[PDB]
From a paper:
Periplasmic adaptor proteins are essential components of bacterial tripartite multidrug efflux pumps. [name] shows the archetypal linear, flexible, multi-domain architecture evident among proteobacteria and retains the lipoyl, β-barrel and membrane-proximal domains that interact with the periplasmic domains of the inner membrane transporter. However, it lacks the α-hairpin domain shown to establish extensive coiled-coil interactions with the periplasmic entrance helices of the outer membrane-anchored TolC exit duct. The adaptor multidomain structure is conserved throughout proteobacteria, but primary sequence comparison in the spirochete [name] suggested that a tripartite MDR pump, BesABC, included an adaptor that appeared to lack an α-hairpin.
Numbering used by the authors: 43 to 317
Write the structure that this text describes.
């Protein structure tokens, strides 16, 4: 007793990656709005979301109709072949030839569009890896690669368009028209000691961590350099080796050489990338 207790980490070398948090939409390179030829009322829908349609195929029907006439017309036809990606009108609604009824296009030319601000663009290059996230779980995250950076800077919004091509499998669930968080990876620090942000401790205008010595059951305060910090993880360099025991809870009470009580040893952070 009179000793300060702890939980430590079995520290490991790994990869900490820098990334930009962006927002983007799932688009397709080949799509088109279905516009009617006549003004009038929707009498039937012969399409469902998901349906493949031939160019010129009848998709919706209208009133025959007017007083009148003399051009009694005209069904709605698909402007190109493809899949129905959206339906924007229902039975009963009236439509002019500038009324978007639905969208058709290809499901195999998926593309993520995102507008990177002027101040962040510099660190981006074609071939960069990215994670497209629509949710928190494994089925809701997909891999991608930067395909194309526009040379044009929209002087209005101060942004450059970056396009990303998704890769891997599960891409079925990456649905066209969806919103996505994008994590665009600009760099990776390989072969660095990774530790939770908490273990790092500012005392006297300098950062340290606490290495545990199992034989003497006490700690040593070592000066450390933070190389990079992200996701509440820290990459560092120092006289910390693989498998050293560094404290990840209870550093408020400690000084250099203070005795301790090791309650449990947490397993190290993944040797592979944070993202």
């Amino acid at each position: 007793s009179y000793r300060f207790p702890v939980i430590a980490m079995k520290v490991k070398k790994g990869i900490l990656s820098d990334y930009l948090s962006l927002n983007g939409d799932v688009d397709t390179k080949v799509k088109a709005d279905i516009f009617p030829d006549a003004v009038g009322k929707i009498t039937s829908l012969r399409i469902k979301l998901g349906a493949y349609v031939q160019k010129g195929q009848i998709v919706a029907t209208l009133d025959p109709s007017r007083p009148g006439s003399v051009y009694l017309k005209s069904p709605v036809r698909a402007p190109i072949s493809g899949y129905i990606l959206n339906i924007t009108k229902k039975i009963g609604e009236t439509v002019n030839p500038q009324s978007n009824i639905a969208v058709v296009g290809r499901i195999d030319t998926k593309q993520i569009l995102t507008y990177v601000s002027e101040k962040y663009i510099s660190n981006i290059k074609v071939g960069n890896d990215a994670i497209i996230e629509v949710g928190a779980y494994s089925n809701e995250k997909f891999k991608a690669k930067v395909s194309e950076i526009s040379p044009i800077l929209d002087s209005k919004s101060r942004t450059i368009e970056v396009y990303l091509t998704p890769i891997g499998s599960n891409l079925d669930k990456l649905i066209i028209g969806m919103f996505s968080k994008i994590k665009l990876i600009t760099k990776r620090f390989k072969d660095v000691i990774k530790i939770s942000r908490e273990a790092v401790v500012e005392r006297e205008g300098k950062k340290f961590v606490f290495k545990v010595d199992l034989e003497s059951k006490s700690v040593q305060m070592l000066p450390i350099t933070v190389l990079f910090e992200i996701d509440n993880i820290v990459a560092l360099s120092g006289e910390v080796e693989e498998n050293d025991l560094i404290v990840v809870e209870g550093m408020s009470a400690l000084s250099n050489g203070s005795l301790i009580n090791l309650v449990d040893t947490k397993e190290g952070l993944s040797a592979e990338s944070n993202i």
